[PDB]
DNA sequence: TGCCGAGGCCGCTCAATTGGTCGTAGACAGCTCTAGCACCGCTTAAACGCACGTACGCGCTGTCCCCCGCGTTTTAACCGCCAAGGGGATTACTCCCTAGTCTCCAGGCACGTGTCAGATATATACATCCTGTGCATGT
DNA sequence: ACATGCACAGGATGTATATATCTGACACGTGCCTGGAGACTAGGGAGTAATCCCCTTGGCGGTTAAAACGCGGGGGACAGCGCGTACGTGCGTTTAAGCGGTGCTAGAGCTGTCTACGACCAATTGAGCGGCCTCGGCA
């Protein structure tokens, strides 16, 4: 996917299904930086145990699923509380 | 005069898809 | 860009084959010759001896042109360079 | 040429091995400046400006 | 038929000859002048080979008539004989 | 006369129009007439020269240098210089088959 | 000393017959090297002819033959 | 004066190029000529190559005198070296073709034998020609 | 007033006639291999569109050669010695020439492989994650 980006952009895919999606947890990655930006109508994450790390890695999976309301890490630190 | 150009068009139109599909059927196993 | 061009240079300098297509060059020989005389015949090997000499002449021209271009530091080549190579090797003026 | 063949992992001489010998040796090269070895190709050479970095 | 069959010199062949000559990038100005320069070389080799053939009264050019042209032009060739 | 001190690098052209016109040999005879002997004697000692042989050498060698310089002029102009510089001679002497 | 007999202004004169406008300061001694190796390559062949001819004055014919062989020929010395 | 952020280290992950093994077929050595025509023989075939001798004349070694080689300071044009622009050559794709293998036709020409005529080398006498030479002459 | 140009003498040079024959132009048989075109095949290439990156451009700036110029050494120009070069000359050694003898090296054959020519698989070296750790840092 990181090597063939423009060739996978060459089709209007309905679903980018994404297996074992804990692979996206690093927002620093070229993987996640590309994977936010593919044009498709819908997406799936199929995690064998999601998240389970520091807040930025929750944010990284969340923002891939939905871009809405995830505007900053500090608002996400507000959002038992 | 066009028939000798048309018979070349139809044979390459099948040969195009034929080789690609033949390679697909050899590949996927 | 420009990395695979170095791999092309390595590949064609490792190989030894004809770089021009035989049939187009075979026509070119006959098509030139037909106003030095009418209706020339050519032995099968003669077109190959012509093509070998022509490709060797062209490889030598590009070799000498490479030295012209890299003397002018430009890695890209133009007629601006070939017109030194012919003029200094001696085929013109 | 036989050294060129050995170094090329061969023992039948072909025009390539003669060209490699003739263009590696400066004495043969300067004796043989006005001649082409048919189907021997050319000696492989990259300019220092074209090599990496 | 007869034609300007120098346009039988396909552009990849010129690129390959240049790449065998180790030049890395080849401007659009090169190709058609290089066809001219190649044709000018063939013209002399053919002129001369045709004249070695005229002494023999032949229509049939051999590898020898071109090797003799290449001798008088000082661009000799080994492998075809002569 | 009238241009006098006009533009340095142009009394150069006043020199071209002298030496291109004239029949002279531009190396002094006596220094060269010794040097040819020094070049010869390494291979065979005690050689003489015909008084014409040294002139034949000078005239061929000055013509060879003049032709090399004019080819080197094209090497400078190709690199967009009017000054000849050592690398110009290296190009010419390689392409004419004298150094490779 | 003998090679410096190719005088510094002679380099300028020869290059000015050769049409060149300006000379870089490094040209001179390496150009004496080019003139030296050219002279040497013709003179050694001329001596090679003269030795076969038994003589030991280097003749205009000995150098004409060297220059003719090396394709740098001259006319006016009785070719 | 409590708490974290950005970045470096050490290590896996997976994808590019490369060196080595297996087999089938182009063109090798190895015959095996047959076959004839090259390479070697003895002498006699002549002259051209070869050695002394020395007349003869050009090349070194000192002339003697005006010009060129050598060196500096100066100067305005040039080349060393640079940043930044936007033209254009490389880039991958899907498009098409004609290059190449081959199977065969079928024709024009290159080649070799047999012939003979008319050409040149050799050899001599024929007969007129070009050169070294003294010193005249024209720009 | 010098390099080039004038006619005579000398001696051989080009020449004309001659004997003897083999070189080479020709018709014909020869019969190859080239010219030709089509069927078949799919690897290569044509043309377009993307966009990276390169050569050109205008420029700052230094420092270089040209430019102007003088000092003193050495290049350029004749007499004087003597050593080499061009022949003169007869000697004698060198290869050429007759055409057989017969050896091996030749075209072209056929032989069986069998190196090395394709084509496929299993190596070693490349940039991007992942968690740790510390240094640098703010409040």
Swiss-Prot record, chain A:
Component of the chromatin remodeling INO80 complex; three different complex modules assemble on different domains of INO80. Interacts with DDB1. Interacts with transcriptional repressor protein YY1; the interaction recruits the INO80 complex to YY1 target genes. Interacts with YY1AP1. Interacts with tubulin alpha. The chain holds residues 634 to 730 of 1556 of the full protein. This is Chromatin-remodeling ATPase INO80. Transmembrane segments: none annotated. Signal peptide: none annotated. According to PubMed:10574462, widely expressed. According to PubMed:16298340, specifically expressed in brain, liver and pancreas. The gene is INO80. It comes from the Eukaryota. Although the ATP-dependent helicase activity displayed by the INO80 complex requires INO80 ATPase activity, it is likely that the helicase function is carried out by the other components of the complex, RUVBL1 and RUVBL2, and not by INO80 itself. The DBINO region is involved in binding to DNA. Belongs to the SNF2/RAD54 helicase family. It is found in: Cytoplasm; Nucleus; Cytoplasm, Cytoskeleton, Spindle; Chromosome.
From Swiss-Prot, chain C:
The modification N6-methyllysine is found at residues 14, 22, 37, 80. One of its GO terms (cellular component) is extracellular region. The modification N6-(beta-hydroxybutyryl)lysine is found at residues 14, 37, 80. GO terms for molecular function: cadherin binding; DNA binding; protein heterodimerization activity; structural constituent of chromatin. The modification Phosphoserine is found at residues 15, 44. Keywords: Acetylation, ADP-ribosylation, Chromosome, Citrullination, Disease variant, DNA-binding, Hydroxylation, Lipoprotein, Methylation, Nucleosome core, Nucleus, Phosphoprotein, Ubl conjugation. The modification N6-glutaryllysine is found at residues 14, 37, 73, 80. The modification N6-crotonyllysine is found at residue 14. GO terms for biological process: chromatin organization; epigenetic regulation of gene expression; gene expression; nucleosome assembly; telomere organization. The modification N6,N6-dimethyllysine is found at residue 37. It is found in: Nucleus; Chromosome. The modification N6-lactoyllysine is found at residues 14, 37. Acetylation is generally linked to gene activation. Acetylation at Lys-80 (H3K122ac) by EP300/p300 plays a central role in chromatin structure: localizes at the surface of the histone octamer and stimulates transcription, possibly by promoting nucleosome instability. Signal peptide: none annotated. The modification N6-succinyllysine is found at residues 14, 37, 80. The modification Phosphothreonine is found at residues 38, 65. The nucleosome is a histone octamer containing two molecules each of H2A, H2B, H3 and H4 assembled in one H3-H4 heterotetramer and two H2A-H2B heterodimers. The octamer wraps approximately 147 bp of DNA. Interacts with TONSL; CHAF1A; CHAF1B; MCM2 and DNAJC9. Interacts with NASP; NASP is a histone chaperone that stabilizes and maintains a soluble pool of Histone H3-H4 dimers. Belongs to the histone H3 family. This is Histone H3.1. It comes from Homo sapiens. The chain holds residues 44 to 136 of 136 of the full protein.
Swiss-Prot record, chain D:
It comes from the Eukaryota. The modification N5-methylglutamine is found at residue 39. Coiled coil: none annotated. The modification N6-glutaryllysine is found at residues 30, 53. Disulfide bonds: none annotated. The modification N6-(beta-hydroxybutyryl)lysine is found at residues 30, 53. Transmembrane segments: none annotated. The modification N6-crotonyllysine is found at residue 53. The modification N6-(2-hydroxyisobutyryl)lysine is found at residues 9-10, 30, 53. It is found in: Nucleus; Chromosome. It is involved in the initiation of both imprinted and random X inactivation. Ubiquitinated H2A is enriched in inactive X chromosome chromatin. Ubiquitination of H2A functions downstream of methylation of 'Lys-27' of histone H3 (H3K27me). H2AK119Ub by RNF2/RING2 can also be induced by ultraviolet and may be involved in DNA repair. The modification N6-succinyllysine is found at residue 30. Belongs to the histone H2A family. Core component of nucleosome. Nucleosomes wrap and compact DNA into chromatin, limiting DNA accessibility to the cellular machineries which require DNA as a template. Histones thereby play a central role in transcription regulation, DNA repair, DNA replication and chromosomal stability. DNA accessibility is regulated via a complex set of post-translational modifications of histones, also called histone code, and nucleosome remodeling. This is Histone H2A type 1-B/E. It comes from Homo sapiens (Human).
UniProtKB/Swiss-Prot annotation, chain E:
There is a cross-link at residues 11, 39, 59, 71 (Glycyl lysine isopeptide (Lys-Gly) (interchain with G-Cter in SUMO2)). One of its GO terms (biological process) is chromatin organization. The modification Phosphotyrosine is found at residues 31, 68. The modification N6-succinyllysine is found at residues 11, 57, 59, 71. The modification N6-propionyllysine is found at residues 11, 24, 57, 59, 71. There is a cross-link at residue 11 (Glycyl lysine isopeptide (Lys-Gly) (interchain with G-Cter in UFM1)). The modification Phosphothreonine is found at residue 60. Acetylated as part of spermatogenesis progression prior to histone-to-protamine exchange. This is Histone H4. It comes from Homo sapiens. The gene is H4C1. The chain holds residues 22 to 103 of 103 of the full protein.
